[PDB]
Amino acid sequence: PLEKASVVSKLFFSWTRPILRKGYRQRLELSDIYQIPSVDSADNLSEKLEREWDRELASKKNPKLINALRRCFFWRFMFYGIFLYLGEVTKAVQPLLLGRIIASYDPDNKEERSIAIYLGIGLCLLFIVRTLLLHPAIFGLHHIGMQMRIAMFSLIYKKTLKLSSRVLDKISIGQLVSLLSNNLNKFDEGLALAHFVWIAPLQVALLMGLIWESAFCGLGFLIVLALFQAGLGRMMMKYRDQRAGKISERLVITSEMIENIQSVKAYCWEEAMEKMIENLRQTELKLTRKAAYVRYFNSSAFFFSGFFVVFLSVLPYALIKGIILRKIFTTISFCIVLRMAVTRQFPWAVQTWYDSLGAINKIQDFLQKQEYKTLEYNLTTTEVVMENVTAFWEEGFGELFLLGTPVLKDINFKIERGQLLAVAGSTGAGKTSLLMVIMGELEPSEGKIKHSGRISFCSQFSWIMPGTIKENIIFGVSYDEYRYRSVIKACQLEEDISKFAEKDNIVLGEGGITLSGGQRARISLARAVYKDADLYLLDSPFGYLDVLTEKEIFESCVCKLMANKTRILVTSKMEHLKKADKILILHEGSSYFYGTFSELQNXXXXXXXXXXXXXXXXXXXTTWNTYLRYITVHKSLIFVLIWCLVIFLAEVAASLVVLWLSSYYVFYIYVGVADTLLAMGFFRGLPLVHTLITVSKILHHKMLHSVLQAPMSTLNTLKAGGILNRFSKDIAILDDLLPLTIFDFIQLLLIVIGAIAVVAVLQPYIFVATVPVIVAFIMLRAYFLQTSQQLKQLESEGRSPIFTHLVTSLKGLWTLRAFGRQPYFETLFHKALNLHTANWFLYLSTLRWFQMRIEMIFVIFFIAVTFISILTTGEGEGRVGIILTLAMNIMSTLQWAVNSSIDVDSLMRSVSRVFKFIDMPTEGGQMTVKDLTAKYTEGGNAILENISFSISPGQRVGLLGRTGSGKSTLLSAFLRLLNTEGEIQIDGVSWDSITLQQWRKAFGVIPQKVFIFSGTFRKNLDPYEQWSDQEIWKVADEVGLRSVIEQFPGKLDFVLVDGGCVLSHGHKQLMCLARSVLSKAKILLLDEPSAHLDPVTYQIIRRTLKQAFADCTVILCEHRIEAMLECQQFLVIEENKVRQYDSIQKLLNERS
Ligand SMILES: Nc1ncnc2c1ncn2[C@@H]1O[C@H](COP(=O)(O)OP(=O)(O)OP(=O)(O)O)[C@@H](O)[C@H]1O
Ligand SMILES: Nc1ncnc2c1ncn2[C@@H]1O[C@H](COP(=O)(O)OP(=O)(O)OP(=O)(O)O)[C@@H](O)[C@H]1O
Ligand SMILES: [Mg+2]
Ligand SMILES: [Mg+2]
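Predict the joint structure of the above. Result:
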């Protein structure tokens, strides 16, 4: 529906209560989120931004995006900014009322308490006004940021779809995804904070024009302190930059680890790799600890500023022999606000302004790319003809001309309507370039073209949009049943479409993942045929088709349906060329022949942004069980927390005794500033950070030990990308951000609790006033979290549609440019962006409501405490002032405390998953199988079921079968890689009676895909450090690795960087065979040695196996006829059955 509300409801955010109620009661769905108002429609934002951007481009000599952006959206920005400034002015000014109240209570004046209470009610009204004029302005600024982001995304999508063809191969997909990823939160949330660029200077000017002029020492200290904070900021980036290189090196080791869990389990390498990963983590831990230490010093310096910033301000005026407590209390209340405005607000505003300007400049720079210029095709006679065509891909050579290499030179031809052509050439000859220049994507430097306009495209690359078969074929045109039936019958895709349960509206995903290459190609041909045009362009139409189907499809459709319509074909076959009318051949970017035979014969696709939807969906947030598990894992962490609590309580007790009981007048500062009174020093908080780092290291080590040495069925139940995502993101969050968030939350809760306790001790009525306030805080936070977490999760799940649409549009850019479905793609992109905008808008609205209500509750607490304290007829001069100051300066710390309280739960939502993966479960030589059965996962397809066979010692077994029949599954079942029931006895012992560890070592196998890691040859041969140089040399000599060792510059220590691709397939097979010879096993297992092998390495492998394992049993797997001469026994897998034969010549009797 459409939201609508009155002025009071708009100001107090009372219209978000229905969705809070629904989310609290039950799980939120995509249906309950109401429709965005028309103000924030993607189409409206795009139109409004373009109407100014095009005018700016047409008028301004120097183009800058901010020039149009200001005349677009600056007015409301300033309108919200003035409200923000007037709200902050009240916070700046309110301590004057505090000082006057203190003067009223002090025995200097005889004025009754009536004036004091008349001022206190005004102070509370001032807080109410400041809240009411602060929070809605922040929400409005967030709204402005929303419109900003939506308009920017729409315009940049329009540009990236209108891109020129030349810059497409300047591959910057990573740059584009980074641009659309890193900006969404930064340019949206930061706009509200961006307005403090002049608010802080105006506030400090007001503060120091309202303090008696002396007081400049406070500015001198803050200026040094502000520069000091930036001084440690550079150190942070110095350590982070250094460590970022090492985490990349360690991560790729884990990435290569998941892809070969089978090989790792077979080789029993869990301990060595565990030690290697532990060593790498130990190396990175020092840098992480240094970064955490400097962050702690920065935070502690900020917290300890509070005392010195007033101390160094009062001492210049303390030499004048007298300070009234009213003056010191009011200068404390002024200096806290001054510090808040100087040390944090101004640097944050400057940094966010710089980041926003950089992002806008980068977006403009990308947008200023050269456009795609289409050409009218109204030139008559509707025939394809060119003359003197010169083509240059790069603009520099295109505008100069033979300085650069061309791709088409001096090509001429002319074909009447109905005649079909054929182009043949080598790979990269330029057939695709000729197609592009015919289309108009490539601009010809020389040569005028006159031909028809209606064109059709079937690209080399298969592209399918996320729709259905009918939509993929017709592209929204009127559904012609006769044409559709004719095209499906001609393309012979009916036999494929009718196999599915769905017949007419089969829905596909992105990129046609459901189908295969042949189906995608035939769908592309069907689309090309269906597209009504007088010039059909094809680019390798049958690249993924078989020979028979490719031969049949030509005479079925091409010269039967559009035989009277002109088309251009890409082919290299004599029959197609013979049927073709005129012929063109391209060589080295130049045409080779023109005429007839009458003359001739006479870096990731499924990115983490897309995997996050399936990764974060299992959070199910969190419970206190994970809190307890995370807090009790390490003893020293508990001891340090206990020590911190004891120190806090001791400091509170000392302050209490001091208040119960010369420089005394300058001693009240320490107690009067809870920020410096209860902040943890460098001797009581550094062990906390150290313990957090140790907890992170222990959790990572246990997670590695759990993911490794785990049942393969359960491990394969999850995907490799998903299991790697944890080590990529969750460990980094738990190690870097989590300790800092934990420390900040602990400190901000400790200061607030100490302030409340001491205030209650000075006045016991405030103790009973606080309990309802605390329970209200807790209840309201619990109420808000349930809806907030669900809304954030839904928004995160809704992020990936935008990027999937982006990649889908990019993959088929040429097809979209040829077909003119730009409006359809724009409206679909806007449809997705509207849902994402609605999610983010509701999240922002509920966050603003939460902040409003917590501030209102604190205001109620403040009025209660202040009125009760001022009305009570207390004794002493300090008590009233100190209580008022403490209860007045808390709110700034309380906001950060509650923000950290929500953020710590948001972060620990990840240690929840980490603990779940901690909690995942864990587990001659003759053979005789007894009813073997296994499957990839429980409930899967039992490839092997009720299997019984035996192998004689000192023999060989040859295994033959089609691909995918289950040979790999049988080898895994032998290896105990998968869950199995039954037994196989090696001379009498099965899996059950002996340890699986020694079971694995008794075997030996090379995988279908060999495994190698980024390590030296010595480490890849002997990861366990159980071998010596002489025996390694002996193994290398026996297997024949001397040439392999000497061929590389590093003698036996050449590092295998980037997956060890230096070795060939045969070299890798020799490597793993030598490794198996090292791991001495009485039995050997084999799996397809000749997938991409050459005869010399094949025969050397045969020689090595014959010489090394002549007296064992080898289960060889190969389909070659010549290979099967050395297999005394035979075995075949034919659809879940096994037949063992004494010879192969009798097998040929069955299947000659
Ligand atoms: N947009 C482009 N910008 C720059 N170079 C390009 C672009 N498109 C293609 N090329 C390159 O120009 C050359 C022309 O090759 P083209 O693909 O046109 O020939 P082909 O024989 O049809 O190719 P294929 O081997 O893909 O069947 C190739 O080296 C190709 O990589
Ligand atoms: N990781 C996996 N998860 C789920 N199913 C799988 C997995 N790997 C393979 N399969 C299933 O097993 C089939 C292939 O079985 P497998 O590779 O073990 O037999 P094969 O005859 O040795 O294969 P090939 O000779 O093609 O390597 C696949 O088509 C699929 O149905
Ligand atoms: Mg090509
Ligand atoms: Mg296989």
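The radius of gyration is 38 Å.
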